[PDB]
Paper text:
The virions of ALSV consist of three proteins, Vp25, Vp20, and Vp24, and they show only a weak sequence homology to other virus capsid proteins. One protomer is made of Vp25, Vp20, and Vp24 subunits, and 60 copies of this unit compose one virion. The structure reveals that the three capsid proteins have characteristic jellyroll folds that contribute to capsid stabilization.
The Vp24 subunits form a pentameric protrusion around a fivefold axis, and the protrusion sits on a base of Vp25 and Vp20. One of the striking features is an ~120-Å-long N-terminal extension of Vp25. The long extension has intimate hydrogen bonds with Vp20 (0Vp20) and the main body of Vp25 (2Vp25), and forms β-sheets with them (between β1 of 0Vp25 and β9 of 2Vp25, and between β2 of 0Vp25 and β8 of 0Vp20). In contrast, a smaller number of hydrogen bonds are found with Vp24. Thus, Vp25 and Vp20 have rather extensive interactions with their neighbors, and Vp24, which forms the pentameric protrusion, is more loosely held. Also, there is a hump or protuberance of genome density beneath each pentameric protrusion of the capsid and a pore with a diameter of ~4 Å there.
Residue numbers in the entry:
A (entry chain C): 2 to 216
B (entry chain A), E (entry chain A), H (entry chain A): 3 to 168
C (entry chain B), G (entry chain B), I (entry chain B): 6 to 40, 56 to 99, 117 to 145, 152 to 190
D (entry chain C): 2 to 55
F (entry chain C): 56 to 216
Write the structure that this text describes.
């Protein structure tokens, strides 16, 4: 043993070794040490993991004939409202305070066999389009797809993005904004209905809860 | 050169009207993502510095008409930036082009393989997709059919060059 | 990470040039100095919502004459440590040292700050050039006006 | 799951996943989706490929 | 990033009093080693220059009471820096939390797995451990029970960043 | 479990017969928690409900309590009768070493039980049978936990908007 | 050994600067010049009782003009040998050359001494930066006030 | 550090007198090759720049007396630079030291293994070899015995440091 | 070959400094200029009788100002060939080019001679430092006074 002892740099110092602890003045059954692991458990009878694959939100807004110019926003949905509504699907979702959620959205317009127009269903992720936008420069480039509103019912999935590893839901007014945009005037415009009805169904494709709300 | 196997761009072209009538009609859709508008599309946000690119295009096309509207549709590629005012239906049937009746098939996806004489697409070199109705469109008393396309994605993407940021 | 070489990030205004020296620059692909898109890196940052990756900065200085290059330039970094260059330039590579996954670009924060010790006398210009590294990433879309 | 998650830089973002499309108000035989590939075909009865060798 | 499999820190939190009574009581213990006091702890002496760290915490908890004192104890983690004033016992039993009677189990070790939305702990992001007595504490005529915790070590430690030495 | 309360009662309320805590079943089944809001969606059906009580005491004091199910709601919370307490369906239990629970079925005159707008679902009470063990130098108030659980539920009609 | 780059150890006071030259510095992670914690290396040394490892020192000099850099700087070490740098800086790596296992940091000695030959005329500043090497070690705990 | 398996130095210490008598006697020999004299020894010519060294010492010891001279000799190592004026023979026999009668064994070789608390020998840290005669020396009427040692070599040599050439 | 770095062999006297230039130095571990032991290499050479091995010489020059460094220094060797350095130093490695086995150190000859072309004007100091190489050897003993 001399100065040529190789030194392995460790952070564990031997100034505190095995801390033994022994019961002295009473019985063990009266004095117990518990070793637990505080992990997050979603509840048993509810929690977003029941909505996995199922619908949790549904609206039916309307839009007029005069709003069917190119680019006009017809219907809008803030994801922070769709996830915090008054239905049973939402109230099970506002209990998740942080986690992951991939959400399916579907649109469906009821039309005659006469009229038929095309609509884009866009996911404005940074909420850069208020509902009073007739741009079409922004509509044409946003992520989404076009579909015909007479013979079809169009749906797609999108993942909620978080800068961190999970996504804090509590007090998060920046979860995205879904829009239905008009690309063109209707097929026929004379002697036609002056308003339409579109159904929106938001579903849960996947949910993970990394922290659950407790009172 | 940077290579991207799948490159989604979700760029939708302008929707083009067609009045009903017997006259032969053509709707031209150029596919030039380098073309700028009010907002920069997903293509320009990542590959606008390039001088030219290469890759197969995928286009979702859509024809919105009534249920009592008849037309024959020829979807025709145009490469090397040629201009066709009129088409010879004899030439199209000789090349085994198949027309589709929009009363039966009015939605589709067109794969456009890379074809350019120069070797790449650019600001000036781009493919065109022509929707050619030879017999016009036969619809109910003042109908307009609308043809709308969306450049969905670019498969097997490759790009070169480095332009100046103006 | 396909931009050819160092793109121009920022020129120091010709009023704060010889007056003492300290030059704070946020480590970001955005032209955060303007709280306008200048080059391709700024363009990619403005058309995306989030970013992570390494940035290679390089400060180039021009003096009145060669005699005015009285020392070699230094560059400090924080989230004080420094790196020393030569008398006419200084390179500094800044890896992603924030323990998150991504940082927001614009309206949807900095990876730190560089502090360039400016010259003190008889300098002509001080420019800063940036290279987007190799493990870079812009993981979203964001609408940017084309006007 | 922490900041040491390795990041693979991909250009495909999950802000638009599988776009399902379903027929609602009519029959399929009345509404079909065609998937074609617009390639160049030389004509059958003429075209320079007949002059090959001649 | 530097990685440490086992990192002992032996930091003891402030011991918190609880008077006996029927009112529901909560003792909050934040676990923020970046928090400075009079002396720098073993965590700060070696990893205070870091911007943020990651790793599982091990905490020795201790409840000192009399031998004739009854209480139910819910040890509850709180991540992502949320503030809970009141707990819903229905919610705790739905999440399968088990309470312990301090007249039978009043010493323990809590493993806290790494859970943070941002991706790491920091000066502002840290876990909390809440000792929640729903029925208060029933003790002999003026007793105060004391709850004391010690951050024992950090397992699977990882840390990044480089702050300025102020 | 679908419901949980923690009410309190004073030392001076520990006379024989006094009602300490009360719970209307039409409120426990229509509260604000997640367990209740899942239950207010059932408009009619069957439900057998478990109820458990638990009082936190020292090792000095110990008193007995009856946990009664007043099914026709004939005892307001300001009742010190004990004539009514002694005969109501329920059981006695010691509040220091024990935690007492029992099941009861909600009765309907018909075949199912209409839940919507039904303020006659029963009334659970905790009644004091005797003065405390020791009364000098003792706490002046106590804390009792009540946990209502579902033993069985059948839905014969569900609410739709 | 997780500190990013060269941290600032010591600036030479602007009175002993041009007066001849010799500059004795103890090879230690402690700010032994003060017989106050300055940077992260000093902080880690003050919160530990013992230390061993290699230290990478670097002296940076600033002259009035480039003409005043009349020679390249040298740095001597002892426990006389020297190393020669360039005209504006000099690096010197000092391995653990004491035949012990650890050296005490503060109240519970130096790994040697560097002697920097200072400039003799028309110099502006002389700073010394230190890097904790890679095979470094601080093997104890020690209480340090946080005031 | 430089390593030398065998390093001969052939340094002889000063020969120390001992008068005959009954008083207990001690002859101390420090083994400090860094100690300088009139001439530089083989150790200093090659390893004087070192701060400290390490290695086992080999020492040839010699006791020159008459043929009618009796004494018991205890050769005792002293490490870590302690000073012993008197020895406890009880302690030496408890440590199983064996004495040798110089009328039978008065020449030898002592292997000194490396033992130092600091980790190396130096100018100030060196081993000592003490020749302890507990009963004195019994010789013929004015004899002086002479004890002389020679540091023969250093086995498994290792050295570090770099001093200033003064 | 265990000496840390370049040890100081010889300083040129401040009278023959600016006067033209040529500087003959024998390639030997001995301070043959004195026909007194200066450093560790001289000490090892004086306490041995014979030597062989490679010697790494390095000449360091100091000028009045940077402008006086009008050329890069050269160093010639013989047993005329030269090596060219930079404007402030010149290194020259001299292997054992005598076809013998050993050369005597002192009273029991040189491995050649270096010729340093001295500066001609406005120089301040010229020093010569030597490194004992790696394949060095001192194969004898020799008595040297310690006074």
């Amino acid at each position: 043993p001399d100065f040529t002892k190789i030194i392995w740099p460790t952070v564990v110092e031997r100034n505190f070794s095995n801390p033994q602890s022994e019961i002295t003045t009473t019985l063990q059954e009266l004095y117990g040490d518990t070793f637990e692991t505080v992990s997050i458990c979603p509840p048993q009878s509810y929690g977003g993991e029941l909505l996995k694959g199922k619908i949790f939100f549904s609206s039916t807004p309307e839009f007029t004939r005069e709003d069917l110019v190119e680019g006009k926003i017809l219907a809008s949905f803030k994801l922070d409202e769709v996830l915090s509504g008054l239905g049973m699907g939402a109230m099970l979702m506002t209990q998740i305070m942080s986690g992951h959620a991939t959400i399916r959205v579907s649109a469906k317009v009821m039309l005659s066999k006469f009229c038929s127009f095309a609509l884009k269903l866009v996911y404005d992720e940074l909420m850069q389009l208020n509902s009073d936008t007739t741009d079409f420069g922004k509509i044409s480039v946003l992520p989404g797809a076009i579909f015909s509103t007479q013979e079809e019912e169009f749906s797609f999935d999108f993942e909620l993005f978080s800068p961190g590893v999970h996504l804090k839901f509590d007090n998060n007014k920046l979860l995205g904004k879904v829009h239905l945009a008009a690309l063109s005037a209707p097929n026929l415009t004379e002697n036609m209905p002056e308003s339409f009805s579109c159904t929106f169904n938001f579903s849960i494709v996947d949910v993970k809860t990394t922290f659950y709300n407790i009172g | 050169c940077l290579s991207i196997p799948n490159f989604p761009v979700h760029i939708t072209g302008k929707t083009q009207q067609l009045h009903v009538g017997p006259k032969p009609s053509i709707a031209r859709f150029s596919f030039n993502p380098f073309d700028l508008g009010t907002v920069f599309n997903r293509f320009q946000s990542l590959c606008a510095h390039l001088e030219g690119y290469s890759g197969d295009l995928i286009v979702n096309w859509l024809v919105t008409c009534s249920a009592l509207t008849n037309a024959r549709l020829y979807i025709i590629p145009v490469y090397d930036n040629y201009s066709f005012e009129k088409f010879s239906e004899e030439k199209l049937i000789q090349c085994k082009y198949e027309f589709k009746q929009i009363s039966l098939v009015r939605k589709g996806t067109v794969h456009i393989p890379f074809v350019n004489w120069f070797g790449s697409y650019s600001r000036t070199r781009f493919p065109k997709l022509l929707f050619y109705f030879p017999n016009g469109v036969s619809g109910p008393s003042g109908e307009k059919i609308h043809v709308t396309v969306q450049l969905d994605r670019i498969l097997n993407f490759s790009g070169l060059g480095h332009r100046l940021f103006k | 990470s396909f931009l050819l070489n160092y793109s121009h990030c920022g020129t120091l205004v010709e009023s704060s040039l010889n007056k003492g020296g300290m030059w704070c620059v946020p480590v970001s692909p955005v032209n955060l100095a303007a709280y306008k898109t200048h080059n391709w890196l700024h363009f990619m940052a403005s058309t995306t919502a989030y970013w992570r990756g390494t940035l290679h900065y390089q400060m180039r200085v021009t003096y009145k004459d060669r005699n005015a290059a009285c020392r070699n330039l230094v560059a400090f970094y924080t989230t004080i440590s420094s790196v020393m260059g030569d008398s006419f330039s200084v390179d500094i590579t800044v890896p992603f040292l924030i323990p998150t996954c991504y940082l927001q670009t614009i309206r949807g924060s900095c990876n730190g700050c560089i502090y360039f010790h400016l010259p003190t006398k008889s300098a002509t210009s001080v420019q800063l050039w940036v290279r987007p590294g190799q493990d870079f990433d812009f993981a979203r879309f964001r609408l940017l006006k084309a006007g």
